[PDB]
Amino acid sequence: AELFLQNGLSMREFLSLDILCKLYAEVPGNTTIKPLLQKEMGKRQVKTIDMDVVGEVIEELMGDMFESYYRKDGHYFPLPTPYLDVFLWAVLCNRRELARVLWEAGREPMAAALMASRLLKRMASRAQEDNTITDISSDLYDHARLFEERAVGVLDECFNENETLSQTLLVRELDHYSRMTALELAVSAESQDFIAHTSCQVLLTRLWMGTMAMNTRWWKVLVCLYLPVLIFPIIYFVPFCDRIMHFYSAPFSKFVGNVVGYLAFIFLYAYVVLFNFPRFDPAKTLGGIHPTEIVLYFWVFTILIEEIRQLAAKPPKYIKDKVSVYFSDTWNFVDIFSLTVFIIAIILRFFTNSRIFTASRIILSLDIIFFIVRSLQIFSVNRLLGPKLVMIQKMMQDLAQFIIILAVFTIAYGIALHAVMFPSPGIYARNNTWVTITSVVQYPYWQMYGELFLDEIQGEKPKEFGEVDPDGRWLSPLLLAIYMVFTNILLLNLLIAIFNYTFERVQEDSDKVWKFQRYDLVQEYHSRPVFAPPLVLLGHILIFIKIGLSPAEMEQMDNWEFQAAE
Amino acid sequence: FTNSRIFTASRIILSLDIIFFIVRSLQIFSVNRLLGPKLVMIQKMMQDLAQFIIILAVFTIAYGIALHAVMFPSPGIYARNNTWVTITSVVQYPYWQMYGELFLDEIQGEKPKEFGEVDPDGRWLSPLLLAIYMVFTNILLLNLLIAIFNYTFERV
Amino acid sequence: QEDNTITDISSDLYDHARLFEERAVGVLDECFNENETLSQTLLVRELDHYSRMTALELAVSAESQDFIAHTSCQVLLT
Ligand SMILES: *[C@@H]1O[C@H](CO)[C@@H](O[C@@H]2O[C@H](CO)[C@@H](O)[C@H](O)[C@H]2NC(C)=O)[C@H](O)[C@H]1NC(C)=O
Ligand SMILES: *[C@@H]1O[C@H](CO)[C@@H](O[C@@H]2O[C@H](CO)[C@@H](O)[C@H](O)[C@H]2NC(C)=O)[C@H](O)[C@H]1NC(C)=O
Ligand SMILES: [Ca+2]
């Protein structure tokens, strides 16, 4: 194929629509793409293959509201991109050297390599999670890593001459890739080697220090954030109210504003739940509500209008697609959960019942935890702290996996221990279903942390624990001996070993995963209102009341990118 | 100065400054091939602890705000009518629970004299919150910090 | 590494610094393999073209642990 392309043949004259549909027709059978295409043709009841089925497979196999160009262009119902779609065919078929040749022969190469990496590793996940598809997943991850390092090398050769061209090449509209950039193609692909490259990181620093000097510290931004008249001496700009609006346009300034006003919010929420959250009564003024709780209502309404703004400012047009893009990160799950739990608590605020207000204060006092879980994204600005947060997230995945084994042994020993201490048809009966079930759950759990109930389970302390059966009084130390040698020593250190394996896997790439989540931090603070940190709701009022280039400039971009690829 | 508070501050400051003289003593152990590298390990692990302490304090103060807010509702009969014991309880009780000193008799409403009258709906919720805090902090966060220390140990 | 206005080429710079570390260690080793007393008196010279500081002081400014852990520097420190 390479020899044909470099002796007498061009893809522009060779490939047509029927050759391409036939090329997707005689895929061999040991691939992932034949089960995917036959599953999609089973969903449409069409016996022949066309490019709309291939396009829908590519759209569900890229994700993130990707729109494949076979569905929108009339040439797929000469061809515009013959190198690109024969390349995509060779990538879907898991053909190493053929996709290499078609990548080397085609235009927009790092975008092609990042799309190939996303497509191959999402085929790897698809073959791993489906039993009707042959698990060739390690081959697909190796091929995706091969396109990862090809994209990183093309970016590196672009970076070794005229870095400004690299920064403006990473943010191009790519009309043959559903109008998304190389940054967005890389973070869809989770290509951590591409984002941790120096070009993407200085670009995220330019976007992060938006029209402002790249080494201005956080305390200068802090003292200029609440004193705008002091912006003019010390804030250095990379080129009047132009300097003011360019100071507040920085996502780092919006970040420091979110940090300081959020610490004010957490201190206010803590003052409410720890010092003043009274029972509602219509007798005294304002219902008895302290105005710190009113300012609390104001700032959580501000966070709610903030999340409604983030839902409305999503790049798709349909509201369901905006919701699907909005819930693509877990931070929006934490946001919607904390806001909904707050709104439930403040609905239950006003009912004057003792149980309903008790539920309200309990729900609010447990929702401070979820606001501080939302606070955890702030620590991703630090090279040292953010990887530890990624460690915490993957260890919580490990804990949610191990917790069924831990609960199985815990409930087994709890059933045994409570059955030998408290025989229920006897004088030693706990005549209460709830304290029996919570004892089975509770007592092995606290014994698991070395809080040994040795006085309790041997028959002493009969008032606050219970009258233990006298033959449970000698058997309970033996059962607790087996449980301590099996659970505190073996099971817990097994879980610690799982956590340490997770620690080593993240710590060997901690720098690169911080570089990758730095993109998510920049995108989190790039779309915030350009406004005062106590007045961001006024900013949402004043909202209520990725670059494109010239076509000859785009062809010049493509020529420079293709020769750096050469 | 013969004042009771000023002399108390003097003896407290002297009795805490013996610690810093013995921190200065730590350079003597660099004459040993075996001990001095362990002191370099202690120094880099204290750097690691000073980095991890903001994450540990964030989760500690979160659970402390939650725990003290469910045990002691401040506009109620179960109010701790003292700002200082509230703030030091939020700092203090998750910290000692983090080392397995579980205040299970205290947070379930028993020992009302030296701990405080716990609200009866905090008496069942405090073991659940402490369960989540023990499975998240003594198991996950502390062994994460131990893993950081072990990575530092291997590097040195 | 600590400045954002400077391109982070830091790993290349640490590799180049380690390259000069092992070059210095090898020159000290070839100095040590004949007449060790000359190595000890060479490590403590006034170096007027280096602001009058020794090879020991240039190495501990550089934190060149491979140079100080060489046998010449250690018997000199003994
Ligand atoms: C739980 O209920 C059982 C059932 O009545 C109690 O068992 C009785 O206890 C008395 C004195 O303790 C004996 O005289 C009876 O013979 C027991 N009945 C049976 C069927 O064994 C038991 O004491 C209760 N336990 C608690 C803690 O309330
Ligand atoms: C803290 O102060 C509050 C405010 O007075 C006390 O709450 C009162 O307690 C008495 C009896 O305990 C009740 O009769 C009142 O109705 C309560 N007032 C309110 C507004 O709820 C509370 O007892 C004090 N707690 C401590 C430990 O001193
Ligand atoms: Ca959000």
From Swiss-Prot, chain B:
Topological domain spans for side Cytoplasmic: 33-44
Membrane topology (Extracellular): 2-11, 66-82, 99-123
Localization of this protein: Cell membrane
Residues annotated as signal peptide: none
Renumbered ranges of motif Selectivity filter: 99-101
Glycosylation sites: 81
Superkingdom of origin: Eukaryota
Residue ranges annotated as motif Prevents fast channel inactivation: 104-106
Ranges annotated as spanning the membrane: 12-32, 45-65, 124-144
Intramembrane segments: 83-98
Function: Nonselective, voltage-independent cation channel that mediates Ca(2+) and to a lesser extent Na(+) influx, leading to increased cytoplasmic Ca(2+) levels. Functions as a ligand-gated ion channel. Binding of ADP-ribose causes a conformation change; the channel is primed but still requires Ca(2+) binding to trigger channel opening. May have ADP-ribose pyrophosphatase activity which reduces ADP-ribose levels induced by oxidative stress, thus preventing the channel activation by reactive oxygen species.
Family: Belongs to the transient receptor (TC 1.A.4) family. LTrpC subfamily. TRPM2 sub-subfamily.
Subunit structure and binding partners: Homotetramer.
Domain notes: The Nudix hydrolase domain is dispensable for ADP-ribose-dependent channel activation. May be involved in the regulation of ADP-ribose intracellular levels. Essential to prevent response to oxidative stress.
Name of the protein described by the UniProt record: Transient receptor potential cation channel subfamily M member-like 2
Organism: Nematostella vectensis (Starlet sea anemone)
Covered residues, full protein: 937 to 1092 of 1551
